[PDB]
Amino acid sequence: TARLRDQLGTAKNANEMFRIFSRFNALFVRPHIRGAIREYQTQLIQRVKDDIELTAYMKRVEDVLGKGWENHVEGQK
Amino acid sequence: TARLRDQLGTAKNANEMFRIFSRFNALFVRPHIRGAIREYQTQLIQRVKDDIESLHDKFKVQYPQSQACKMSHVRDLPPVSGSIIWAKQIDRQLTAYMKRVEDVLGKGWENHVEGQKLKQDGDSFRMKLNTQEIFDDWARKVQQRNLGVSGRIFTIKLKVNFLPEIITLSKEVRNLKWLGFRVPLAIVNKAHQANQLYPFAISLIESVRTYERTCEKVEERNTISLLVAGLKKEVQALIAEGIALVWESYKLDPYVQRLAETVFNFQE
Amino acid sequence: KLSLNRQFFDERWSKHRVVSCLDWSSQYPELLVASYNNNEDAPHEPDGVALVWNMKYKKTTPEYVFHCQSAVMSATFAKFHPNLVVGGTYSGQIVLWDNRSNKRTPVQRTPLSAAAHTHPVYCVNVVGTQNAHNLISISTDGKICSWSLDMLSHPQDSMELVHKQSKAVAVTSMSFPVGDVNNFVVGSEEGSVYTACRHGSKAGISEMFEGHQGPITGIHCHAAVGAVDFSHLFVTSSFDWTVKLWTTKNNKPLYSFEDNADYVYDVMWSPTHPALFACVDGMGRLDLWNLNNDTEVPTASISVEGNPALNRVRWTHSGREIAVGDSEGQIVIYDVGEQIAVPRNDEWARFGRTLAEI
Q1: Do C273 and C224 touch, CB atoms closer than 8 A?
Q2: Is there a contact between C313 and C324 (Cβ–Cβ < 8 Å)?
Q3: Using alpha carbons only, how large is chain A's radius of gyration in Å?
């Protein structure tokens, strides 16, 4: 989680956020890291929604919600 | 007994030797050990008499006159529960000092030459500390008021029928339940409804206040009425939708949010 | 030796007000922010007030002044935003003040929605790092919410502290261990001290700690850092007239100090000395307990003039100047003798030995 804080300490735009998200896959499933993801989702997913309102952008959305991104309550929409 | 003389050879203040008797309490059950310690028991009994005198003096000062009531109100504790807590803490300290006397004099302290007066004073003071009358009076007053939140959410200046006291009753129930007093079922249901409907009522009254101030600002500057017509008629339509609803309606969960959001929009 | 170094008071703002909370700026140790609730006599006056006093200059008046419509029950410095001051209010509306901005009105205020705070917020803190941090706020209905300073309109995270099935916790005080970001401790009005976890599978109340038979008034974890890790110790002051020392691993209190003759409204560890903490009671008495010297009598004691109901106490990050606020808005600052404040090199080993003695 200290590393996760360092992620926002390092990345500035959305692309580096998604890159360092892709480097860390196991962190999406364990139900302790997701709180940190909830800190970043409002910064990223909403922004990505603001960018949408294709397949590349669905990859952008997927990279924040992990594998099988359609299962999440936010990924349903 | 040499070690029990080393007790005073080492101990300095009364608290340390109180703790020493507490730790060595069983050892004084022996008759020779009990007879060894005679002059220190009088000193500690007089100190406990001083302390229970201090408790008596504190209890002479009425609870509203004491800083306890003020600091309880400052820390969100309701005044009736604050008085109950004050009486309970005084009772706890009385019991602790009674246990200290038992430890100092050993078992059979109720018949001791000095412990008889202490037992009598403790019994009378504990009888005076009984709190059930306060709970009975408060419950009777609340039941006689017969407070009720059920009804239309709105009434017509616009207003929302939700007073501050409904929260204070809920907090009174919250503290008294921990204090163990059997609150009546009707009071429990009233506190339940208060707790559930408090945030919705706060959102609704805040939205109404925001709409009132924004409407006053718009009316004070009539030149800008046209650009803000859509938000005005939108919030008025939402308010009209809210007239038919009651506090038991399930539509309040989004409504108190959604209207407020439009009201928030109506500010910007 | 306890010597009154300074005497802060304002006849207009702080008069007829109690000091609800205190805090020191970590970056600027000279500064001191303090909170004051609603004035009883004059409803025309703003209810919540937040005053910033200074130790560098002899200016009697506050260095800065802020106010808001609801009584400010807690105030704090943003530990990584020196220009910002945060405050939790009786209405539950968190408010923000910027010293760069000249507005006495709050620059950013949270909503009073159901998802946001609605009950009074006695507990506000900033937790995290410079690279990223969160404003954690807990109300008296058990609701905890994490916000961001850049955006107070929406709660970044929120939940409810619930333990023992259908039963909320009326959090009165909070504290975070040093070096801990996820775990914290809170004090209910029922006396049960709950150790809780921010994020996790068991996020919420994790452990119960019993022993206090009155409402908790103030909790603080071991802020002193040294070779021996004592971060698991924390002290609680309650309405029992007691200060209880607890271990987070141990479900029963390590020790109890009962010398106080009235309620104990606040206690906090010395930030530099490991075994020294300071409490303030209702008889206007401030007591410094050093567990490496004594355990049944305060190591130092002083009485405030007029004997007001002392409410809050805080130490300076240097660990020398102690600022305590009372029930007459009369903040009083004391300086301690160097033999008490500064620890000897063996105070940590001696503290470990005294803990083992228990």
Answers
A1: yes
A2: yes
A3: 12
Q: How far A65 CA sits from the closest chain C CA (Å)? A: 17
Asked whether B and C share 3 or more beta-carbon pairs under 8 angstroms, the answer is: yes
Alpha-carbon gap, residue C137 to C158, rounded angstroms: 10
Backbone angles phi and psi of C135, in degrees to 5: -95, 110
Which residue from A75, A40, A39 is spatially nearest to A59, judged by alpha carbons? A75
Both tokens assigned to C328: 């007459």
Q: For residue B225, give the DSSP letter.
A: T
For residue B120, the SS3 value is helix
B27 vs B38: CA distance, rounded Å: 15
Which pair of structure tokens corresponds to residue A9? 């300490």
CA distance B87 to B59: 9
- Show the tokens assigned to B11: 């101990």
The partner residue sitting opposite B85, judged by closest CB among C122, C214, C258, is C214
Instruction: Tell me which amino acid residue B186 is.
Output: A
CA angle C73, C77, C80 (to 5 degrees): 145
DSSP C344: P
Q: Looking at beta carbons, which residues of chain A come within 8 Å of C198?
A: 35
Technique of determination: cryo-EM
E strands, C26-170, are 31-36, 48-54, 64-68, 72-77, 84-89, 95-98, 108-109, 123-128, 133-138, 143-147, 157-160
- Tell me how far apart the alpha carbons of residues C260 and C240 are, in angstroms, rounded to a whole number: 9
CB C20 within 8 A of CB C311: yes
